[PDB]
Amino acid sequence: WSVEDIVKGINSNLESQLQATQAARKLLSREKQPPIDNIIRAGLIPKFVSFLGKTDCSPIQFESAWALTNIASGTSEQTKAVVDGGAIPAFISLLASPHAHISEQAVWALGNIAGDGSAFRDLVIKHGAIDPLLALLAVPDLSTLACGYLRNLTWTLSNLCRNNPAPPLDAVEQILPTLVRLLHHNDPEVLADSCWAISYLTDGPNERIEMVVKKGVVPQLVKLLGATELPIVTPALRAIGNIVTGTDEQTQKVIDAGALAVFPSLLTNPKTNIQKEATWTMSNITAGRQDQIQQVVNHGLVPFLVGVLSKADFKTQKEAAWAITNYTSGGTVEQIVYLVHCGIIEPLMNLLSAKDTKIIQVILDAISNIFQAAEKLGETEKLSIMIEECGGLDKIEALQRHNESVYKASLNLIEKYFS
Amino acid sequence: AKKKLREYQQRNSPGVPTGAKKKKKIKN
């Protein structure tokens, strides 16, 4: 239909209204550029918001809820148009409908509104949205509820966990216990958004990381870390990666839960984003205590990092360089020279042909601290020859006339070990 | 030192994965 014909019917006013609003919903579901902006300009949102209230006529409720859901899926200004029409409390009222498909539609719409950003998220929370949403999940068996219904509640819950400033502590504390239950329910999509919700909560001050970790979720997170569904592995690795940016005791909980045994598959995972985030998390584990570095050693992960450093897309090679410089900064003399036995030298020397000023210095820091270990064991002469034979000395020799801070770092290696 | 996600995402974005923000209903 055209928008004009819809307006004659909404303002004809009850049997006529449903067909026209129904007609609006079909128009707003169309594939290419549903004409969202003209429906707002025609003034139809206040009637649609009015439409959520005909407890008598559930059909006009559902259609208006659907039309409004799909206006709120658009730009921030279009979402703003929905909120400005009063939809939040009307949708919150609709969560309690005895008709399951209408309750879900309100859940979905509320998910779109909260997903726009931190201001709309907190405003939805301020209206009292958390309790009736959680009240819907307060069943003895989560497999009691329709599968599609449960998926939206989890998704809607995850957008309430998302995003400067963070959600009020009370909201995260209040929603979280239902989140842990959902993290164990056997549906692949529910799990993904549970991990997403958990992934959001662990990005921030160590007090927030600490909070999720108390609930015993880390063993389960490492389990999803090994799932075959990529939509599950992706958020699980993000959540684990955030946790290992924290303190030494939180990092010990991830290792002890068995996370490292999954990393041979992850650091060779053919999905570019999986391999890089696994390399980044390794960079934060190798920034830990010496007993945790030997545990990466014990799990055999050094050959895998030499492999990523040797051949991967360029951004991971930079992530591995941090893992290596971190390893060489905190490790024992034996652990660092063990790097040399594993073949660390050639892919490092090959990577120094790169012109980015920043990574050159990261690689050179690793090389000097490694030489200092060689100094303690009396093996510097073996290493100097090793660096020269794979072409590393020429490159190092060439960096004196290449940022000047890179150049003075390169000369120092030359004066001390190649004179 | 440990480096938090903002620094990683700042190094690597655009394109860092995240969950769905909005969904359009075509179904039902």
Residue numbers in the entry:
A (entry chain C): 76 to 88, 90 to 239, 241 to 479, 481 to 497
B (entry chain A): 13 to 40
Report text from the authors:
GM130, a non-nuclear Golgi peripheral membrane protein, has been shown to bear an NLS-like sequence, allowing it to interact with Importin-α13. Since both Importin-α and p115 bind to the GM130 N-terminus and Importin-α pulldown by GM130 is enriched during mitosis, we hypothesize that binding of Importin-α to GM130 during mitosis may suppress the p115 and GM130 interaction, contributing to Golgi disassembly. Our data describe a molecular mechanism whereby Importin-α modulates mitotic Golgi morphology via a Ran pathway-independent interaction with GM130.
The structure was determined by molecular replacement using Importin-α as a search model. The positively charged residues of GM130-NLS facilitate interactions with the major (five lysines) and minor (three lysines) NLS-binding sites of Importin-α and, as a result, GM130 has a larger interaction network compared to that of the classical NLS (IBB and TPX2). Interestingly, we found that a two-turn α-helix that connects these two basic stretches and that is normally disordered in conventional bipartitie NLS is involved in Importin-α recognition and binding. Notably, the crystal structure of the native GM130-NLS•Importin-α complex reveals that Ser-25 is located at the bottom of the GM130 α-helix, and is not part of the GM130–Importin-α interaction network.
